[PDB]
Symmetry: D2
Subunit: 261 residues, 4 copies
């Protein structure tokens, strides 16, 4: 089909990209970075995240694949030595596809901006104290005071979510997970503390109490938003599709990354 | 229909039970604690757990309801003043039912014992050091050294799971959560640390490394098992059914219990 | 003696300041905000922190006292109704003084800036990834990757240190405590995780690995420092002196603030 | 002087013991396991703990030394290849000694038992729910509900204390640290959560609320105590003395054990 390859930019990943293109030249494949059906990422998980966001409006027409030239990644989970075998099997096609859930972030102002996250979306203040009211399906759940909040996808749970104490969720679970950053808890101010895992169709709404300016991240992207009335989280209707060419279980990927490999 | 009522035993809960029975006597209801279709628990969540385990072989033919005479419970979530209104609506029937997932524990010896948990199942040693190999879907994930492990249901996540750092999961998610108790982590011994959330059909197997005697809890029940070859966790095929007579969202129940009420 | 009074600025604290000044006018007291020997703070702990930093070059010649017009503070630990009794006992003098340790932060460039902290000093990146090498008494201890680090005084342990998982230390202990913010731990990157408590004369040095720009906070003050070669932490030789006019134990102050009052 | 050597019992440690004894036979040394002045432990930290407790009534007349035949220990911190050099320098004497603080546990009944701990002392229930009132210097601080409590020495902070979230304290600090095991925190029951670090002369008292039977551990020893009225913790007046024959900083020992070696 049509395909394209993004590279981290170092000479290891560029030279690997050129060899795969040359290998693809021996099959019924067309290089097209406008409307590809296969997107190959060569580098690390950061390279994969840029590839995902480069094409986030054609997600249902694309199967992603990642090659790690550095350490093993959770998205770039195939080694460079497998590139030739990867070229042949992608060209023959007829592979199976797997889908991971995504997170939808809505930012409203007094003007509504929506973002798609593969890992997580975080909210911090623009300098002063961070205070928001946390609303779950229209019921006021808590007044959070602290550094910030993080809403993670299942496959994002091994990233910033993990460093904040969140649970690791198998990506077949259509859910999102909210974790706290350095919350203040005393006799006056009370947060839940524990991570919270929300199913599909649950809406988590953040509403300002005083300051209306927040630094909002979506994966790598981080923008200062001004005059926001609401931050809105829910599991996206859209999913990311991975080209699957062998068995590499998520829990094995967790073992290889954090226990030993 | 047929119904029965269990009481914590104090005079507040016994006298409330007698008044509901007398109130039920004005309707087409039959008291039967052998084959009831409605099980009413009056006391706390512990009273509810005993009622659940008393009838865990007729789970698909029973709708449970709980009344808290002490503080608000996550299962006994209706107040005693609502008993009269509860009697009338149960008698008329035509209520909606909600279902929560359950945890299945299998203990094998050298002789296989299965248990159903509404909250969680924990494993500790019988005295000496607790060491098990943790196997996820037949792949060896980690060698756990510490005090013990805890596998929780979604509705159990607000109980022992919460005290161990686990996430709170909405009970509509068919999953189970594994949390660590005081794990040893150094250069030699490595555990994942983070809680792990497993979907249906994932099997988590604990296998002894040296000692074969473990103290295993299932909700309130705690038995010392000897000569065990494997402890096996998975989401049960069976579910507990609750009689639903108004809207009391899980996240509101979490708010009322941990934030303020 | 000479004395001065700072107020949070609201009319509750200003009117309380004027009444204490008028009450002081009936004794051998002189209002002097240039070289006072008694510094009275009326407001909250933030008002007290500004008073401490306003006079941090005359620390050995000043006894501080704090009045909380809002909720109970750890430094402003006397209620407004005690102001009249406070005026009379300060004027008579002959009170006992208590001393708390302080934290010394040294920032070197390629140009060396020293700061005194009553609560804590934190280090974060100026945007990108935060990576520093952590050196303890000239031995390289770890390479920290994460959001940032926090070094707390004993009396600061109930503030940001507590929200990060740090221990609460009784202020009679001459020490400082280092806590991590959202550290990354996998097979490649390893931090200690646990808070670290250092005695006097131990020097904790942070050294950049790549980026040389850091956002450094000292209590409330937060400055972006550029071209820094080293951040240096140690227990200060200087201490803050409190005028003590009755028994209010630190652990009781902890109980009143976090358990119930 | 007089000396003795304890061995873990495996043939590696026994054969090393015999060679050191033979090496000691070439100097003015006497083997005496009744009144030694040097106690050599060959094995692991567990072997060292037994040696410490074997002679805990002659602590001020003994300098301890530990040899690790397995992995590096925090007390057995010298390798077997250094045994010959260790023999020669102990025989010549004139070494420097270092001292670590110890923890004193007092158990009173309705009959008072005192124990000395090098690592920590823990308290759990004998089966049912664990509830104690926590009293600090005669002020009631909290009502703890959970699995148990752990009071650690400074050098014990790298052991069970670390697994419970406690801070690592440099052993030159005369203090003790209290950490919680799986505490219950909701609207009704409140604990401090954070570890607590207490200086010398602070007394931490545990008092039963209902059940009077507790499983109390002191390092390796674990005894079920019945009819206890109070558990009493404070920094001991006694200290353990180590023979110091080169520089091996505590923080380097922490680095080698948890970061990499
Ligand atoms: C970029 C990126 C990224 N995504 C991750 C993930 N989903 N799990 C673990 N590590 C991850 N990284 C690297 C920091
Ligand atoms: C028995 C019981 C019980 N079940 C609970 C639950 N699911 N969530 C929160 N608290 C709970 N309890 C009381 C200790
Ligand atoms: C400003 C300030 C301040 N200092 C504190 C402290 N030492 N302990 C607890 N809370 C504290 N605050 C309020 C956020
Ligand atoms: C026995 C023993 C022992 N004491 C220790 C200590 N003080 N720090 C770290 N590990 C330790 N161990 C081994 C479990």
């Amino acid at each position: 089909m049509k395909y394209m390859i993004t590279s981290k930019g170092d000479e290891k990943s560029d030279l690997l990209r050129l060899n795969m293109i040359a290998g693809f030249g021996e099959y019924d494949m067309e290089y097209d970075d406008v409307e590809p059906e296969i997107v190959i990422s060569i580098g690390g998980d950061g390279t994969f995240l840029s590839a995902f966001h480069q094409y986030e409006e054609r997600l249902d027409e694309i199967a992603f694949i990642g090659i790690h030239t550095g350490h093993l990644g959770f998205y770039a989970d195939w080694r460079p030595a497998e590139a030739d075998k990867l070229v042949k099997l992608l060209a023959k096609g007829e592979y199976q596809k797997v889908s991971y859930p995504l997170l939808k972030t809505t930012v409203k102002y007094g003007k509504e901006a929506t973002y798609l996250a593969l890992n997580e979306s975080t909210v911090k203040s623009s300098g002063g104290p961070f205070v928001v009211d946390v609303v779950i399906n229209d019921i006021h759940f808590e007044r959070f005071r602290g550094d910030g909040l993080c809403m993670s996808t299942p496959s994002g749970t091994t990233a910033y979510n993990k460093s904040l104490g969140g649970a690791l969720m198998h990506p077949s679970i259509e859910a999102m997970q909210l974790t706290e950053m350095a919350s203040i808890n005393n006799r006056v101010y009370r947060t839940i503390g524990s991570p919270l895992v929300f199913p599909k169709h649950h809406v988590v709404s953040l509403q300002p109490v005083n300051d209306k300016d927040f630094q909002i991240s979506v994966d790598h992207l981080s923008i200062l938003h001004r005059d926001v009335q609401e931050i809105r989280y829910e599991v996206s209707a859209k999913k990311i599709h991975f080209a699957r060419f062998r068995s590499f279980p998520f829990w094995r990927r967790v073992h290889d990354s954090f226990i030993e490999d």
